[PDB]
Smp-30/Cgr1 family protein
Amino acid sequence: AQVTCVWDLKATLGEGPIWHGDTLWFVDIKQRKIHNYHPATGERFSFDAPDQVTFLAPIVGATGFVVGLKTGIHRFHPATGFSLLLEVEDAALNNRPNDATVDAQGRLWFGTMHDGEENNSGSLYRMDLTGVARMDRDICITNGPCVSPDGKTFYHTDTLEKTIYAFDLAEDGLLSNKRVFVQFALGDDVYPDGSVVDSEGYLWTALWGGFGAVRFSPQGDAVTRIELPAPNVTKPCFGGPDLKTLYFTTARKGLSDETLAQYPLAGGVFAVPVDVAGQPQHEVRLV
Ligand SMILES: [Fe+2]
């Protein structure tokens, strides 16, 4: 299939794409923006955030999004802006939220990270109507929380360790039986960024420094690799009428001026048709 650059956005750190309301929502973390792309018309919308904004999730029974800001978990509405829901960590850590997913029970799983990308201060959190629980700890850069279609397996990535872990996910939301799922040896400077799981239970992982994304079987073997004209690919997101259009956010962060001249579409939004559909986006049950 041919890859299309559908938005030559040149984002600094495009991240956190979701498919919602039949359109693509995502963020630019470092430019502090929420973006919205309508594939049917090409319309583009952008919203300024008061701090770094790192993930978006729709809410059950309500309008707007729950979003991760460096200053805490907020509610966002285009008309009214940002309102604090919960501060999850002590500001002195210089942490920020990063990636997130919503499981089929309406739980929001999100990670935090050292914004300086040096300390092992990040954690994994599970947020729902029973509160916020810390589920894993001591990770420098968390990434790519996601769950299988049957709801029994949970994946989480420690990016700088180049490792995706798998867990048993119980019906009551507890994790057990952590094990290595995939350890990356695709290059000295290739790291796993964000991941999603498709309708067959295969994991799609975007590669920082790896110019694309890899699809893994539930047993952890790579079965296909997509190439993009962008060194840093941050996250996949299934969209389109059949959830068979795979979108990718990318990042210019970390690339020299010479590399950006060579790969000027770095930071753009890319799209490619794939054969197996993704999973439908779930909504957070906040109350
Ligand atoms: Fe990420």
Q: What stands out?
A: DSSP finds one helix and 24 strands in the chain. The longest strand covers residues 131-139. Residues 15, 98-99, 143, 193-194, 234-235 surround fe (ii) ion (CB under 6 Å).
